[PDB]
């Protein structure tokens, strides 16, 4: 019971290798790798 490296999704990401069984949480998440706004957490 997670969330990742769990099922097969006709979206993936081949930058971070993430899955994404809905376009939309990708959609986000690509543009979630481009951000100029604030520095990581940590
Ligand atoms: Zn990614």
Do not use: I, W
């Not at 990742?4 to 971070?16: D, Q, T």
């Not at 899955?19 to 957490?41: A, I, W, Y």
């Amino acid at each position: 019971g997670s969330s990742g490296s769990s099922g097969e999704k006709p979206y993936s990401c081949a930058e971070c290798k993430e899955t994404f069984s809905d376009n939309n949480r990708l959609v986000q998440h690509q543009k979630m790798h481009t951000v100029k706004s604030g520095p990581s957490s940590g």
